[model samples]
Target: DFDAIIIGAGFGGLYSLKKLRDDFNLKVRAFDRATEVGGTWFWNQYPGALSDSETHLYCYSWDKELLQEMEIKRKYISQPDVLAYLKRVADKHDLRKDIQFETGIRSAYFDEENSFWNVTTENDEKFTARFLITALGPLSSPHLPVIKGIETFKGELHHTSRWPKDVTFSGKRVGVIGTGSTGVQVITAIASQVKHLTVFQRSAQYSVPIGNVVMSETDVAKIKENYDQIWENVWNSALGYGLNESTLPTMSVSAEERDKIFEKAWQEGGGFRFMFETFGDIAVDETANIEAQNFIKKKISEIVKDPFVAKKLTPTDLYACRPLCDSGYYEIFNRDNVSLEDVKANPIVEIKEDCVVTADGVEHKLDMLICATGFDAVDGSYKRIDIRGKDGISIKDHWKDGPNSYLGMMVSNFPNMFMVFGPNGPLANSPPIIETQVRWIADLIGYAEDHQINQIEATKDAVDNWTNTCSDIANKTLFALYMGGLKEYRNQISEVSNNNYKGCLLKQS
Candidate 1:
């Protein structure tokens, strides 16, 4: 008699539970593999893990009362702070009672006759629900480096997602592989603390100052005063950031003024502000992208003392990936304890008992190895579970070529199932986007109930069309992000919702 079975206990599932149970009065049970709530925040406990988004805008905006009641010390939140916030939310709302923690869903099979779902947990327990929803956040799963002899390493090895609580780097020689956001954060954080730190870089990155600072009393007061407008702007904006994205082109300004604006943002601090607030065309026009590239490159050269190190560090590509922000990331290279190894030039050949060997035959000795290798992203946890829909077709086989879904929410073959933070989600702040998807999904369930629909599924044509739409948008931008902007995408989704779930098949009992 359950209304829904939700997989995961993150922001998506939490809100989904609250909305369905409270607003819609639907019986919902949420499952998480972890023994506790906090989802992504529960896992990522590395030394310097922090949200790049500002604290003011990164929260769940639906809770107006929570927003007004809170006080913030920092502009950006540390991992601990973020985790505490989520825990508080869970405790405050009693979201844990309906949450079955330490329970991993092994498979979900659609019971075709009843048009409901048959779910099997890893412990062999079964649950049946009219609808099954997954809230697997994009970066939920952590990956390991595939280099040979990795298992032979005797000292210690860790991934940022599974960072050990008892370890310290004070006297240990550490080698970190992968310089994505995780690598950048961990590297910048522990550079001065370690006895020796070797950064194994796959590609030179373009990162700006994270510009995190202690908030003023006025800053907190201002947010408290303007919670409504702040959330309104975030939901309707391109980046889901509280600040306004510049409409002006990058090349519109004089060369000197552009540098001045860049310098000002650099001092003020923010990656998104540096990319979106300063120049609108950085991710759109290649020439405009190159200007940002050159600016960051020049700054890298100016900051790093050694020409050889600076040359090695400078990125040759467009500054078009997710804009990286750090607290003095580039400046860490000047430290005597820190060294950079370009894995692209000299690839990692193998791992030994105590060191990583490069193609140049250099063995970088390490007392500990940390792999910030990153997650499978978007479709990861789905593939991990055996989710079978009509005709017992698995989601993994359906997405063999790649992920396909209508509006990054529902797969065509999977009926009465919703995916939050799935493929082609808004290229913006994660929390706001999660709320957007959750509310939409909740509305969908309400629609199904009100209309006495037994099966509500996405159409193949709709899935194909959305895939094409994502592809078209992907080709237009330099980054692997949805270029439609958060507000535009929200309007687009709203259109579908208001138009009676256009391109979906809703069959009554």
Candidate 2:
């Protein structure tokens, strides 16, 4: 039995546990499927794996002391570094005793009579807890392509989502599918080692080059000096990528002038500035976005070396349409060992034991196959666990079409169960968003305890209203209404119809 049970040992879970135990003075139990903490960082060990957000902004803001004392190693911290930071936080707060490592929850059901949650892990461990908090990550579920003959391939297979510890692509022929952020990063890291690399491209992604540089001792000193200011400045900024200056208006800038700004953003490196800082209206205005896209196309042409390859690499969709941020990605195609295979033009007819066969009957032999195909974003992990609420109703059945909650937090019938970092809560600044969610849940718990309320659940009408409001916001953005739709390279998991309204909210009032 526990006062509160948190599912996950990553950023959201760890933070939730700390807030519950330290602040609320409640006993807490948490779980993580991974061997260690650092949810995303623990599992995502693929080469070139790193965060797109600047180091300062991609961290927890709960503890001012932690922010002041810690040091960030790089502009874009790698997977291992992120993992190390999570470990340090857990150890610093002595949180390991409350965490159950490598034991993921299989299912959880609420007991109305007892006013508690009956939670069971995969290993059949059961616990009765007053509160259940799900911190299951934003990008936990990996999406694998459903291509024919994938099972028959008798070679080293890899998905950037589920990377193995002992993977060694040295001298082995590699074939990587997909070209999103993870794909771009892993390919860049392994290009020099793999004997020959074949990239299966269906859609060209707009990649904002990363200004990934080593953080010097001086840089560390400067960061420590202004830690509070950095945290405040970055969190509230429009893009949530640590924009130092005020936002520049996209509508105000002429096409030619915007081109110069876009070019400067590309050269400056790092993906965040380009998407947020350059033009304020780029994400909202379709015509303005085309100017940004033209600049991106030009950059791709300049880096790809070959004119044909450059043309093939350009993203068809305008900016704010699932654009990718990269460091030295397009230039990697120029490597003699690397070859680009357009899967759309040359479809995959079959995947042989050691190669992927195109519709044209060409076989690109490979010793290693890596699937960089992203994840079942929106609602994949939550579906895996069987969560039941009042009247023993299955959460799956409740959200058969898709997952839904009021404000991405508490489902209507799920009393005392809170989902930290719930869907559509904070799309722009994820870290700060998570912090805000933690506070919201913590406050709810506090209120419940103060009022002696056995369970805290949102009213059905209130949840419905919030869901409608969020849908309206998303529909109004260029993100939801682009004529070309979201960039082909990015996953449109949110677009899929679910209990949550992905379509535009009509004015019923």
Candidate 3:
């Protein structure tokens, strides 16, 4: 029924629909599980949830008019503000007309003889399409860990990924498990309002203070004027956080000089800025990584008063996980109502009717529960659906070890199927990453159309080479990311496309 079918409604899906429908003039339909727009922002509606990336870079650069005029009053955009922005974009482009919401995909199969995809909805409604594009983001699937007696919890429960629309935590004793990105945000936000808040930590995290500043139109106007340069800079940059990436190595300067820079970035408050802006070698060099780690650990000890609690909060691991920034996350433990539980040492044994039982035989009572356990990430959502390509080889069975995709977007056997932000993608700011992928996917489609190609799939050699390239690049770094930088990655893709998609196999009609 459609020329192309998109499997999401997030940045990837929304842009796919817009690009294919408006630019390519193709009949595109987008499917989303949410009742409305806003993919990540729509669901992760927990308290104090906001992006760590700055306002200007978190948005799409395509809509020039909207990018210049949007009313952003803060450096860091909140969940609600992001949702509002996405809504405005959708409405402006009239994107909802082609979107089917509150829908689920059961299977999408490739019919080799016809060279078309047979997509089946959850209710077994079938539709055929020439192209199947997945904007199903890597971080969509929320993971709830297995726990004893969790199902018997009589009180209200919520996951950050699937927060209730009308729920309130005011004056309620809330127990939050996990201390990742969402956990830190949730803990910081509810510490002041909730009657009591108990944070269960599996692993302590190193979080910089996200110095989220309120801004006026006057400040925003400066950013608007330089929109073109800003995008150009971001596209060619390393991490794509809109700030100037430091070309200097972490250990290039003396200890005194390095410490001064770290102090300034620490006070300025941004995870990306602290990691990339301060130095380039933190993720690569062990000595530099240790210095960065120690700096934050020292800060944790200073901000957190009690030594015992401070030790519990301090992370002994490398400072290499996606750098986290929070609005007073560490200081929240100083509050009388806010308490920390080291689940790593004393793990959760069970969930009782009115309390959570720790392995140490302590029962912590709670009126409400919140689990910020985070997503299964990448292939979690893909594995959930029965996707078959090339003679009934299921996606799950095909990817026995892990997902191996060409250009992190296309599978070898999945002809005419594409991924927006799939596996082995850049481990950087997401908006810039998403925009780049969508642009490439659209460009590839245009290429296929121009060549009269009906079947487009990555060759086995292309898949192997790309996966090996990613593996080789990742093997040397502490952070498993495309360390060659986004600028380099873009150049590589351009070269491949310019050479008629060297890695991909194209079949003409």
User: Please, what is the TM-score per model?
Assistant: 0.97, 0.91, 0.97
lDDT of 1 by residue, 294-348 (tens): 8888899999999999998888664566558888889999999999999999989
lDDT tens digits, residues 1-509, model 2? 99889999888998999899999988789999888888888888899888877787788877788777766777878888888888999989988889989898999999887788999999999999999999987775787688899988999888887788888878899998988888898888888888999989878788888887888988877887877787766544544566643357776867778878877877777665676667665666787677777777877888889998887787765444746767778889999999998888897878979889999999889999899988876567787789899888887777786567765677877777888776545455567667767866776677567757676676577666656755665566677511211121012222221222232221111
As for model 3, its CA RMSD to the true structure in angstroms is 1.3
**What local lDDT score does residue 372 receive in model 1, on the 0 to 100 scale?**
91
lDDT, candidate 3, 29-126, per-residue tens? 88988888888888788888998788888888898999877877899899999999999989999999999998888999998988889999997879
Worst 10-residue lDDT window for candidate 1 reads 315-324
Candidate 2 global TM-score = 0.91
- Candidate 2 lDDT at 414 equals 76
Model 1: colliding residue pairs = 211-269
Residue 214, model 1: Cα distance from true site in angstroms: 0.6
